[PDB]
């Protein structure tokens, strides 16, 4: 999703409420860089300070629970990931072999979804068909599409 | 709505169009 949900908010409340040392429903701007990292993330000092500038615009030095949840809502996204792309190929590998054919990859791109262009299809074939030696080695092709 | 097969195809197509964007820069209006 592009936005947060009640089942995510219910877990983030338990972490935020330990840093609510005043009991008023707020944390400080210095506890922000603690609570986001104690939730298992690791943003930079610069990314943390830029998210503080988005909520400390009133100059009060404090952050309410819904203002902290705006940072988490902005962090949710529908974009691509290796764990999402890998499952699409695993659904099409009906034999469970860890490889598919060039005919299957051409068909599943030209028939299903929106119909992919032949110059995009023939490139998607080329880089997998060379590596898997006449088969499509999808398990490593997942990485070659999104490595950084 | 679309089928499980159709959204699985569109996930592979979107990842490949991102791979094409970083290779060929033809739609690099992002920056």
Swiss-Prot record, chain A:
There is a cross-link at residue 21 (Glycyl lysine isopeptide (Lys-Gly) (interchain with G-Cter in ubiquitin)). One of its GO terms (molecular function) is protein phosphatase activator activity. It comes from the Eukaryota. Residues 7-42, 43-78, 80-115, 116-148 form the EF-hand domain. The modification Phosphotyrosine is found at residues 99, 138. The modification N-acetylalanine is found at residue 1. Ubiquitination results in a strongly decreased activity. It is found in: Cytoplasm, Cytoskeleton, Spindle; Cytoplasm, Cytoskeleton, Spindle pole; Cytoplasm, Cytoskeleton, Microtubule organizing center, Centrosome; Cell projection, Cilium, Flagellum. Its main location: cytoplasm. Keywords: Acetylation, Calcium, Cell projection, Cilium, Cytoplasm, Cytoskeleton, Disease variant, Flagellum, Host-virus interaction, Isopeptide bond, Long QT syndrome, Metal-binding, Methylation, Phosphoprotein, Repeat, Ubl conjugation. Calmodulin acts as part of a calcium signal transduction pathway by mediating the control of a large number of enzymes, ion channels, aquaporins and other proteins through calcium-binding. Calcium-binding is required for the activation of calmodulin. Among the enzymes to be stimulated by the calmodulin-calcium complex are a number of protein kinases, such as myosin light-chain kinases and calmodulin-dependent protein kinase type II (CaMK2), and phosphatases. This is Calmodulin-1. The lineage of its organism: Eukaryota, Metazoa, Chordata, Craniata, Vertebrata. The gene is CALM1.
From Swiss-Prot, chain B:
The sequence contains 4 internal repeats, each with 5 hydrophobic segments (S1, S2, S3, S5, S6) and one positively charged segment (S4). Segments S4 are probably the voltage-sensors and are characterized by a series of positively charged amino acids at every third position. The IQ domain mediates association with calmodulin. Cannot form the same regulatory interactions with beta subunits as other Navs do. Interacts with the PDZ domain of the syntrophin SNTA1, SNTB1 and SNTB2. Interacts with NEDD4, NEDD4L, WWP2 and GPD1L. Interacts with CALM. Interacts with FGF13; the interaction is direct and FGF13 may regulate SNC5A density at membranes and function. May also interact with FGF12 and FGF14. Interacts with TMEM233. Interacts with the spider Jingzhaotoxin-I (AC P83974, AC B1P1B7, AC B1P1B8). Interacts with ANK3. Interacts with PKP2 (via N-terminus). The gene is SCN5A. Residues 5-31 form the IQ domain. It comes from Homo sapiens (Human). The lineage of its organism: Eukaryota, Metazoa, Chordata, Craniata, Vertebrata. Changing residue 8 to L: In LQT3; promotes late sodium currents by increasing the propensity of the channel to reopen during prolonged depolarization. It is found in: Cell membrane; Cytoplasm, Perinuclear region; Cell membrane, Sarcolemma, T-tubule; Cell junction. It is linked to Progressive familial heart block 1A: A cardiac bundle branch disorder characterized by progressive alteration of cardiac conduction through the His-Purkinje system, with a pattern of a right bundle-branch block and/or left anterior hemiblock occurring individually or together. It leads to complete atrio-ventricular block causing syncope and sudden death. Pore-forming subunit of Nav1.5, a voltage-gated sodium (Nav) channel that directly mediates the depolarizing phase of action potentials in excitable membranes. Navs, also called VGSCs (voltage-gated sodium channels) or VDSCs (voltage-dependent sodium channels), operate by switching between closed and open conformations depending on the voltage difference across the membrane. In the open conformation they allow Na(+) ions to selectively pass through the pore, along their electrochemical gradient. Changing residue 7 to L: In BRGDA1; uncertain significance. Ubiquitinated by NEDD4L; which promotes its endocytosis. Does not seem to be ubiquitinated by NEDD4 or WWP2. Found in jejunal circular smooth muscle cells (at protein level). Expressed in human atrial and ventricular cardiac muscle but not in adult skeletal muscle, brain, myometrium, liver, or spleen. Isoform 4 is expressed in brain. This is Sodium channel protein type 5 subunit alpha.
